[PDB]
């Protein structure tokens, strides 16, 4: 079987969800945009995660701070060359961590999600994006994983807004703050960003695994 | 890469969770117990789900009422031969639907989960079983999917109890039944068992999730 690993890497910028895409310099679906991803390299990859982090770093020059397996798709119809299997990951990083290393490259671009949803993407990659986007919605409901799409440190209004974008729905500021404070997942830097001086926070590592039992 | 699919199939019987294991007849780990699973056959499988259903049916003679993809494990250390990838599924079925078939087969059997968790198993199948058990705990928190591990029709107490076993603690008998009745997932057969109601799962039980934890 044709066995690949792919990643839907999201960030948040100006002021929408953006998804990292790579133009296919390679037949089939040649010249079309699609997910970063590809083949396992046994000489440098020791696990599937190392495979997907390498494929991301080959494009961004950064290992993203958040990554999680989404799904594995495999069947005899998604790819014209043969039965193929793709292990798909979701990732999150901040926009400026790698826009500094990605301006200078023409086959790698951050695309507005809305734009992407109207594009002719290679293979079944549109469908993988939709699945990733939907899992992100659940992350907005049960975690602070959306914080990984922001540059560090961030304000709590920033964090709230990313969650609102994902749920497509204004959310209840004071409930949110209450849940954040009790999760005990943010480090208050003691710094301020100012028409009000807002506290600047970093994510604790354990944000990645922490889940609220009740929805937002 | 060696590419397989595996399934961790659970059921509920004798007030305990069981897991289906299959005894290996070939190397490596020849003679070790492990998950049902193996290679894609492009001649009969059109998708990964068809592969794993075949791997299970080959052993149980029964297509399970519930199956969900769990995770894909791939590394150069779970198999001594080299780089190895396995797409794992979780599945649930009733004990009685396949016990009557696997009773007669020496290399396939339901094992007590608590015992299996302490066993030497083929490859990394113990880790796979642990991760599936963990995932089932979430199902107990957010769905009625644990019902698929029961013979149909079943009673509410019977249903509440598999959730309790999965959760590892008792549960409020009034808030559960409230939860269940608002979800609208059970069909009342109008039939009774000692006089507790007997219910069937609605097919959409597989996909319905509760917003609030149990
Ligand atoms: Na670029
Ligand atoms: Na047997």
User: Domain locations in chain A?
Assistant: 1-123, 143-216
Q: How far is the CA of B115 from the centre of ligand 1 (A)?
A: 54
Ligand nearest to the CA of B107: 2
Question: Among all chains, which residue has been given the structure tokens 């301020």?
Answer: A192
Q: Which residues, including other chains, have CB under 8 Å from residue B144's CB and lie 6 or more apart?
A: B159, B180, B183, B185, B186, B201, B205, B208
Grouping H, G, I as helix, E, B as strand and the rest as coil, residue A41 is coil
Handedness of CA A69, A75, A78, A81 (dihedral sign): positive
Nearest CA in chain A to B142: A213
Q: Which chain residues have CB less than 5 Å from ligand 1, an ion? A: A 102, 105, 108-109
- Residues of A with CB below 8 A from B46's CB? 75-77
Q: Which residues, including other chains, have CB under 8 Å from residue B47's CB and lie 6 or more apart?
A: A74, A75, A76
CB B150 within 8 A of CB B12: yes
Q: How far is the CA of A24 from the centre of ligand 1 (A)?
A: 14
Handedness of CA B138, B141, B144, B148 (dihedral sign): positive
The vertex-B59 CA angle with B99 and A74, nearest 5°, equals 130
Q: Domain spanning A143-216: which CATH class is it, in words?
A: mainly alpha
- Among the partner-chain residues B72, B76, B77, the one whose CB lies closest to the CB of A42 is B76
Nearest CA in chain A to B39: A1
Calculate how close chain A gets to B50, using CA atoms only, in Å.
9
Calculate how close chain A gets to B47, using CA atoms only, in Å.
4
Grouping H, G, I as helix, E, B as strand and the rest as coil, residue A54 is helix
Calculate how close chain B gets to A47, using CA atoms only, in Å.
4
Correct CATH for B143-214 of 2.40.10.220, 3.40.50.2300, 3.10.310.50, 1.10.10.10: 1.10.10.10
Phi, psi of B105 (to 5 degrees): -120, 125
Q: How many CA atoms lie within 13 A of A127 on its CB side?
A: 8
For residues A95-119, one letter each, b for 16 or more C-beta atoms within 10 angstroms of the residue's C-beta and e for the rest, the string is bebbeeebeeeeebebbeeeebeee
β-pair type (B196-201, A108-112): unpaired
Distance CA B111, CA B185 (A): 30
Nearest CA in chain A to B47: A75
- Residues of B with CB below 8 A from A47's CB? 74-76
Does domain B1-123 fall into CATH 3.40.50.720?
A: no
């Amino acid at each position: 079987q044709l066995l690949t690993v792919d990643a839907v890497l999201f960030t948040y910028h100006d002021q929408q969800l953006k998804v990292l895409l790579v133009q296919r310099s390679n037949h089939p679906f040649l010249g079309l945009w699609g997910l970063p991803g590809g083949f396992i390299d046994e000489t440098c990859d020791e696990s599937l995660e190392q495979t997907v982090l390498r494929k991301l770093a080959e494009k961004t020059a950064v290992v993203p701070p958040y990554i999680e397996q989404l799904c594995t798709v495999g069947n005899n119809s998604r790819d014209a060359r043969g039965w193929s299997v793709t292990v798909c990951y979701t990732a999150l990083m901040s926009y400026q961590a790698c826009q500094i290393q990605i301006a200078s490259v023409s086959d790698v671009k951050w695309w507005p999600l809305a734009d992407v949803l109207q594009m002719p993407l290679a293979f079944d990659h549109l469908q993988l994006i939709e699945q990733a986007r939907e899992r992100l919605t659940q992350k907005a409901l049960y975690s602070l994983v959306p914080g990984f799409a922001l540059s560090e440190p961030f304000t709590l209004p920033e964090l709230q807004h990313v969650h609102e974008v994902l749920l497509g729905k204004p959310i209840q500021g004071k409930s949110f703050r209450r849940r954040v404070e009790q999760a005990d997942l943010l480090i208050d830097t003691g710094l301020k960003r100012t028409g009000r001086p807002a506290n600047l926070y970093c994510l604790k590592p354990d944000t990645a695994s922490y889940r609220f039992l009740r929805n937002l």
